[PDB]
């Protein structure tokens, strides 16, 4: 069965824990599974993920045709860290909403980095509506929040709003259940069925580079996405002038391979390339699958000085180094129209612009580093040139 | 959306009906679209499925990831008209049984025409539950509809049976309503999306051959089913030895292919084999997909003088022609201990002997005629030789 990632998203308190603890526990009694406690998923586990710590909880649950990992974190702050560092992808998200309160300004935020880091499909599901018999203040909250999806470019008029009671649902009355049933309908049916990394172009990240005469040159690393089969044409991507290539050979640990696939750590034999040029942070690619480039807009969380972040300021022309990958590289950074300056603990919107071209696309995550020390985490929101 | 066909089937007031109605108001009340009315359904209108008349209700539902096309007939000869004609199709089965009756007559020759008729897959809907409210019962029926469905070859094992009341259901009680859903889910579970024409192994019937001058011997005919490529071996089966040659053109009325399809009426050019090596009643094929065989175990259904069939009865020592595709072979029937005549719109089994060898399997339909009328339909249940 797919395997497809969610999580609920949405301001404090309007239900996303008593929602994520209804869903496993309808889902189970009716198509069969293992029902979570609300305490179970309310008590987060902790997680550093690139040395920030992160509460998050995930829960498992099948529909009849797919299987979910889903992820509920306790506060704003975990969802910041979480959606940035991509350290729980989500292949689409519940919005939870209050129907008492409506839209709130948590609710606006995770939209608004939804986008910023690519959550691809927003299901609804306006919760609380044992407390609101008024039909038309249900649906006001449904207008404001189909605008505000609008605005953060989300299809606002097509989404599918589940309206329901997740603490109702969670209690066993059987109407309210199946307000849960119809929520895992729209999972299964408004979500497309995401890509496997297999299924992606190749990508390799330049780990080392040897050489062996006769067989030329041995680049190794593990395989991001994709495949690379023996004899056909790869490309050395970012740092220089994008390169070109065959490959001639994978291997293992001195077992040869027909081809290398997605998570393995091979070593690829280029044929008509030298050591000497391959620089530090070049990656292999498919032919015309990605490209270099300098300048770009993100999505970045400086660490607090407790998490071992700065313990002052930056301002309009900080130029630290940025990790993609493999290595650093410095840049300029140029930060939104009446910014003033970033303090340790913040999550901004910035233009990056890179010294030297790194192959990348949307979704690209990097480290902000000073010397050896992580200062920040980013994505690349989107790439400008 | 795929598209599945299924239908109910089970012994007289066990609940087919009440089901069908009961699923397309919970689907529709779950995940949109629309009721109809247990009436509508139960008085089912008259068909002419080829000559044949039989009553027929077809309803659609939708679940979030299929389309169902489902068939529901009033009476239990309608069921055997349907499933010896080939009218209804039926990707899978729900097999209704009433937990105050259990298992009755036409439960299990339902079961056995399933078999016969190539019925791949049966779901159990245990019906009428809110009647029994003694456990032990639900076990103890529950076993001997296993056992029974263990008997004709089916994974009595691993089937999934529901229990449920079709009867709550349709009044909208929202906990018999649950169990609606669970049904729906291992429809959409439990039943493979059937094979589509192009994927099964070539075979076509053939209806005349030319030979070209210069070019060599054509064979006519609708491709029935797979594909036919230039370059490919093909057998031609029936009658007498099986020949087999090689493909090295696919015309259609002077523009020439490289292949032919299921549904296309098309002529394959054949290499080797002459004009005069074709006999009537030969089916192209892949090689070894199918054999020729004489005698076989069929059901049959002797059509009712106002289906325009035999007006008189038939006794022990009737010569039938049997139509297989595109020509009658005589043979000579064989009819159970006790049945000492035939009437017209009865439908019986009788085992087969024909005067020459056809390219048969299990499920083919075929046609008795008397002097190219139609006067009976039937399917091969079992090849014997
Ligand atoms: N009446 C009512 N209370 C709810 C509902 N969903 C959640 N709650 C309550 O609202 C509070 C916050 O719920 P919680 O799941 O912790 O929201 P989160 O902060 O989004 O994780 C708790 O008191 C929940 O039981 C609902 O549908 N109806
Ligand atoms: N108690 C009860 N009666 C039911 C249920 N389902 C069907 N029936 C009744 O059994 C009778 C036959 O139902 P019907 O659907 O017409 O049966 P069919 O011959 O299998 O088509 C009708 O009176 C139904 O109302 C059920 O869940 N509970
Ligand atoms: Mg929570
Ligand atoms: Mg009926």
Redesign the interface.
């Known amino acids: 069965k797919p395997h497809v990632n969610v999580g609920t998203i949405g301001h404090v308190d309007h239900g996303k824990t008593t929602l994520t603890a209804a869903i496993t526990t309808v889902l189970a009694k009716?198509?069969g599974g293992a029902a979570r406690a609300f305490d179970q998923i309310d008590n987060a586990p902790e997680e550093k993920a690139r040395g920030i710590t992160i509460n998050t909880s995930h829960v498992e649950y099948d529909?009849?045709?797919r299987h979910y990992a889903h992820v509920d974190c306790p506060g704003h702050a975990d969802y910041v860290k979480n959606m940035i560092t991509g350290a729980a992808q989500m292949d689409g998200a519940i919005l939870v909403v209050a129907a008492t309160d409506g839209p709130m300004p948590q609710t606006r935020e995770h939209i608004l980095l939804g986008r910023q880091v690519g959550v691809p499909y927003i299901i609804v599901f306006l919760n609380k509506c044992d407390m609101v018999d008024d039909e038309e203040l249900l649906e006001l909250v449904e207008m404001e929040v189909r605008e505000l999806l609008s605005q953060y470019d989300f299809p606002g008029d097509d989404t599918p709003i589940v309206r329901g009671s997740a603490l109702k649902a969670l209690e066993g009355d059987?109407?309210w259940?199946?307000k849960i049933?119809?929520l895992a309908?729209?999972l299964?049916?408004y979500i497309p069925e995401p890509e496997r990394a297999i299924d992606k172009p190749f990508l390799l990240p330049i780990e080392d580079v040897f050489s062996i005469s006769g067989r030329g040159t041995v680049v190794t690393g593990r395989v991001e996405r994709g495949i690379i089969k023996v004899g056909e044409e790869v490309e050395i991507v970012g740092i220089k002038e994008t390169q070109k290539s065959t490959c001639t050979g994978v291997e293992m640990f001195r077992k040869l391979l027909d081809e290398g696939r997605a998570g393995e750590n091979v070593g690829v034999l280029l044929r008509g390339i030298k050591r000497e040029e391959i620089e530090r942070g070049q990656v292999l690619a498919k032919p015309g699958t990605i490209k270099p480039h300098t300048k770009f807009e993100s999505e970045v969380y400086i660490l607090s000085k407790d998490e071992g972040g700065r313990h002052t300021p930056f301002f309009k022309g900080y130029r630290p180094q940025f990790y993609f990958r493999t290595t650093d590289v410095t840049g300029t950074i140029e930060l939104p129209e009446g910014v003033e300056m970033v303090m340790p603990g913040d999550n901004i919107k910035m233009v990056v612009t890179l010294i030297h071209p790194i192959a990348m696309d949307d979704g690209l995550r990097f480290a902000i580093r000073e010397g050896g020390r992580t200062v920040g985490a980013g994505v690349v929101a989107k790439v400008l040139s």
Chains 1, 2 share one sequence.
């Open positions: 009716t198509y529909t009849p045709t059987a109407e259940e199946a049933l119809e309908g729209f299964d049916s």
